[PDB]
Amino acid sequence: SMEQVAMELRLTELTRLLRSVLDQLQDKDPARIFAQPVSLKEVPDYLDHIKHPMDFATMRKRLEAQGYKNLHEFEEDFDLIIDNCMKYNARDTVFYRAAVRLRDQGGVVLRQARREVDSIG
């Protein structure tokens, strides 16, 4: 149907916007601490601690399959990155501190993304 096509164009355009958001958030992680999944070879107990691991590569795979229906779903995955790190790692670690900085800097980006998603529809 033509309606299904229109919905698909909307999803495509959301995906374009989320790709730009993802690029901007990932620039706030210049150390690449959140770039890839935590390695279960290197941290074998991880899944005993963290039940829903997340990282920017995994988000990018979902994004490119157009698997984010709305901004809330995308933000859920970004918050997992941060929140997982802040639980597994202690306050005095470079990992925790990187997550705080990513949260703080990403907030700005996400605030305007929400306005754009609402504005453009």
Side-chain angles (χ1 to χ4, degrees), residues 59-60 62-68 70-93:
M59 291 189 64
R60 195 173 295 278
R62 181 164 169 194
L63 178 63
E64 292 311 332
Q66 300 189 347
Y68 296 113
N70 55 53
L71 182 57
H72 180 74
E73 292 187 345
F74 179 93
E75 292 173 320
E76 288 198 327
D77 272 353
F78 179 67
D79 286 336
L80 281 174
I81 293 179
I82 300 314
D83 290 340
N84 291 343
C85 185
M86 295 174 71
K87 293 166 184 76
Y88 191 81
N89 304 104
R91 240 165 356 263
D92 70 335
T93 64

Side-chain angles (χ1 to χ4, degrees), residues 1-2 4-6 8 11-15 17-40 42-60 62-68 70-110 112-115:
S1 77
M2 200 45 235
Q4 288 295 312
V5 169
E8 295 162 354
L11 178 64
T12 299
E13 282 306 295
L14 177 63
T15 302
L17 180 155
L18 295 183
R19 192 176 304 111
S20 170
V21 176
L22 184 64
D23 290 346
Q24 286 176 69
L25 294 171
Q26 188 152 24
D27 288 336
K28 310 315 178 156
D29 174 30
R32 301 193 70 87
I33 290 164
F34 304 105
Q36 294 290 332
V38 172
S39 172
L40 306 175
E42 300 166 3
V43 186
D45 74 359
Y46 190 65
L47 297 185
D48 293 344
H49 292 268
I50 296 303
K51 295 301 171 184
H52 294 98
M54 192 47 53
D55 65 275
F56 288 128
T58 301
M59 291 189 64
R60 195 173 295 278
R62 181 164 169 194
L63 178 63
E64 292 311 332
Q66 300 189 347
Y68 296 113
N70 55 53
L71 182 57
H72 180 74
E73 292 187 345
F74 179 93
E75 292 173 320
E76 288 198 327
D77 272 353
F78 179 67
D79 286 336
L80 281 174
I81 293 179
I82 300 314
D83 290 340
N84 291 343
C85 185
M86 295 174 71
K87 293 166 184 76
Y88 191 81
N89 304 104
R91 240 165 356 263
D92 70 335
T93 64
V94 62
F95 307 106
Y96 185 113
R97 289 165 173 280
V100 167
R101 289 166 61 83
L102 174 62
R103 192 198 57 188
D104 286 351
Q105 298 196 275
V108 179
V109 173
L110 290 168
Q112 201 53 40
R114 162 55 63 205
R115 293 190 67 83

